[PDB]
Write a protein that binds this ligand. Structure first.
Ligand code: SAM
Ligand code: MG
Length: 206
């Protein structure tokens, strides 16, 4: 019936439960018919930095939540902000089925609204990594807002998808220009448009 509802029907009919990999390729076999390419990059970041506390901005149907949760340590948590409650619902389901729901808490609303609440309401000290994948013209404002709430320590890794195609030249000008962020660029490729795109790692310095 709709794109998101039947991604979930597909996953649930074709994937193996508690098998996150299968859940992942269920979504990016269905969708071929941040995929598995921009995926290597995510996997490498998690693998290198082993963050205890990850904030994802934008869970669509659950792909990058599953992707990252998969590789998190027993103790760790992923907070995922999704402003759309129907995607929140689908992300939820996707996680349960992947058996990763113990590691992920789905935060439900606008990023600009939930971020200020992170310390007092969800008991955060500082974030170990932030995956930015929501509204393109929020990357910079939310980065600044994260900084203001002192949600970033030195070493917090930020990872911004779609950086590149379409958007985010301001974000890039700021983090590469600011000396409170050490930046690295990673290239990625978009399937039907045949375009080089990219992600940006920006490691907070203070
Ligand atoms: C491109 S999708 C996320 C893709 C996802 N990271 C993945 O890998 O599957 C963008 C998502 O962020 C949500 N979104 C956009 N702006 C937002 C905001 N300011 N706060 C929270 N969610 C937002 C949209 O509803 C949408 O689900
Ligand atoms: Mg993306």
């Amino acid at each position: 019936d709709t794109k998101e509802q039947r991604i979930l029907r597909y996953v649930q009919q074709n994937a193996k439960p508690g098998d996150p990999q299968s859940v992942l390729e269920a979504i990016d076999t269905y969708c071929t018919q941040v995929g598995d390419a921009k995926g290597q990059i995510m996997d490498a970041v998690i693998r290198e930095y082993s963050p205890s506390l990850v904030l994802e901005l934008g869970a669509y149907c659950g792909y990058s939540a599953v992707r990252m949760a998969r590789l998190l340590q027993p103790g760790a948590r992923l907070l995922t902000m999704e402003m759309n409650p129907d995607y929140a619902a689908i992300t939820q389901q996707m996680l349960n089925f992947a058996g990763l729901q113990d590691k992920v808490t789905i935060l439900n609303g606008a990023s600009q609204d939930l971020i200020p609440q992170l310390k007092k309401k969800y008991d955060v000290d500082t974030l170990d990594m932030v995956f930015l994948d929501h509204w393109k013209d929020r990357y910079l404002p939310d980065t600044l807002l994260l900084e203001k709430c002192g949600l970033l320590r030195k070493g917090t890794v930020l990872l911004a998808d779609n950086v590149i195609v379409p958007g985010t030249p301001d974000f890039l000008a700021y983090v590469r220009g600011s000396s409170s962020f050490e930046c690295t660029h990673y290239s990625s490729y978009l399937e039907y448009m045949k375009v080089v795109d990219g992600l940006e790692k920006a490691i907070y310095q203070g």
